[PDB]
C-alpha cells in the first residue's frame with residue numbers, strides 16, 4: 001500500500017505468484033537500468049493449474065539504484081488499484097519475497113503499434129482495422145482517465161498489439177521520468193499535465209495510425225517545432241484520410257485545453273465511424 005523499497009518487500013495475498021512456477025525466457029525489451037523479459041508462467045490461470053500461458057516480466061539488473069526499485073514498486077502498486085480493462089497491459093502477478101522483484105504483466109505478441117503498422121505496409125492493413133485501432137486506444141484512455149491516472153506521453157511505441165489484434169496500452173502506471181512532438185504546448189513549456197494534454201497526444205497518435213506508422217513532424221530538428229506550434233500551424237492531413245476524421249485531429253491540436261475534446265467525445269465520434277464500417 002504505497003510502500004517504498006525495503007530489504008524484503010511485504011507479502012500481498014491478492015497478487016503474489018510462485019517464482020518456482022514462473023520460468024523466464026528470452027529478452028523482449030532491451031532497457032538501460034530495468035528490462036522486460038518473456039516468460040512461460042505455469043498455472044497463471046489458477047482454475048487450470050496444469051495449463052501454462054506466455055507472459056511478460058518487468059524487472060531490473062544488478063546496477064539500478066535504490067530509487068529505480070521504488071519506481072518499479074510504484075508502477076506495481078498503481079496497476080493493482082487501476083484493475084482490469086480489455087485495452088490495457090494488466091497486472092497478472094508479482095514475485096516479491098525471498099529473492100529479486102519480478103512484476104508479471106500480460107504479454108503482447110505482435111509488438112508495439114509503430115513497428116506493427118510499419119511491418120504491414122503495401123510495397124494487409126485495411127481502413128476499418130486502422131479505425132478499430134484508434135477506437136480501442138480511446139476506450140482504453142477513457143478508463144484510465146476515469147481512474148485519475150494521467151498518462152505521461154502516449155504514442156505508437158507505448159501502445160501494444162496482441163496475437164488477435166487488440167490494442168493494449170502500456171507504461172500508463174509508470175511515474176514521471178525525448179518525446180517532444182507528442183507533448184502538448186502547456187506540457188512542453190509550463191509542464192502542467194492534465195487529461196487534455198493526453199488529448200493532444202491522442203491527436204498525434206491518430207496521425208501515426210493513418211500514416212501507417214509514420215514519424216510525426218517529418219524533417220525538422222525539434223527547435224522550429226516550438227515556434228511552429230505557437231504560430232497557428234499544425235501537421236497536414238496525410239495521404240488517404242477523411243476530412244471529418246482529420247477534423248478530430250485538428251480538435252485535439254487546439255491551443256486552449258478547454259477547447260480540446262474529452263476522451264468521452266472522441267470515443268463516441270470514432271464509434272459512429274466504426275459503426276458505419
Ligand SMILES: CN1CCN(c2ccc3[nH]c(-c4c(N)c5c(F)cccc5[nH]c4=O)nc3c2)CC1
Nearest residue numbers: 028029036056089105106107108109110111170
Ligand atoms: C527482435 N524483435 C524485437 C521487437 N519484437 C517484439 C515483439 C513483441 C513484443 N512485445 C513486447 C512487450 C513489451 N515491450 C511490454 C512492455 F514494455 C511493458 C509491459 C508489457 C509488455 N509486453 C510486451 O509484450 N515487446 C515486444 C517486442 C519482435 C522481435
